[PDB]
C-alpha cells in the first residue's frame, strides 16, 4: 500500500506514535517519506547483506528475521515480511522498540540527514487529526 501523507499521519497517531519518546508526529511522517516514499512494500538491500523492510525500512541484522541475514538478531520477534503489510501495526510496534534503544530516531539515517532540525510540523499541516 502507498499511503497518502495525511492518511499515514492519522494511522500513526492512532497507533500511539505522536510524541512517542518525545518525537512529534511530523518526525515519523518525515522519516517514512524519505525512508520508503510511504510505500509499505519497500525493500532495500545493504552492503553487509542485511535488508531494510517496509514503511520505516527496519533492518534485518537486528530487528526481524528474513532467513538470509547470518548471525542476525530478531529483536522485534517477527518475520521481516510482516513489516510489508498494508496494516502498519507491526512496523509501528517494532519502531517503538528501536526508538527506545538509546540513540532515538538517529537510528533512521534518512531522519537524521533529512528531517532532524527541519520544520517537521509541515508534514502534518492540513491534515484532519
Ligand atoms: Cl531521544
Ligand atoms: Na535478524
Curated annotation (Swiss-Prot):
Substrate binds at residue 101. In the egg white and polymorphonuclear leukocytes. Keywords: Allergen, Antimicrobial, Bacteriolytic enzyme, Disulfide bond, Glycosidase, Hydrolase, Secreted, Signal. InterPro entries: Glyco_hydro_22, Glyco_hydro_22_CS, Glyco_hydro_22_lys, Lysozyme-like_dom_sf. The active site is at residues 35, 52. CDD domains: LYZ_C. This is Lysozyme C. The lineage of its organism: Eukaryota, Metazoa, Chordata, Craniata, Vertebrata.
Amino acid at each position: 500500500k502507498v499511503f497518502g501523507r495525511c492518511e499515514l499521519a492519522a494511522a500513526m497517531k492512532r497507533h500511539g506514535l505522536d510524541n512517542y519518546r518525545g518525537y512529534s508526529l511530523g518526525n515519523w511522517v518525515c522519516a517514512a517519506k524519505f525512508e520508503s516514499n510511504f510505500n509499505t512494500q519497500a525493500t532495500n538491500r545493504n552492503t553487509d547483506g542485511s535488508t531494510d523492510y517496509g514503511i520505516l525500512q527496519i533492518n534485518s541484522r537486528w530487528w526481524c528475521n528474513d532467513g538470509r541475514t547470518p548471525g542476525s538478531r530478531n529483536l522485534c520477534n517477527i518475520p521481516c515480511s510482516a513489516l510489508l503489510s498494508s496494516d502498519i501495526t507491526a512496523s509501528v510496534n517494532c519502531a517503538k522498540k528501536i526508538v527506545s534503544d538509546g540513540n532515538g530516531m538517529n537510528a533512521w539515517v534518512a531522519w537524521r540527514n533529512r528531517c532532524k532540525g527541519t520544520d517537521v510540523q509541515a508534514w502534518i499541516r492540513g491534515c484532519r487529526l
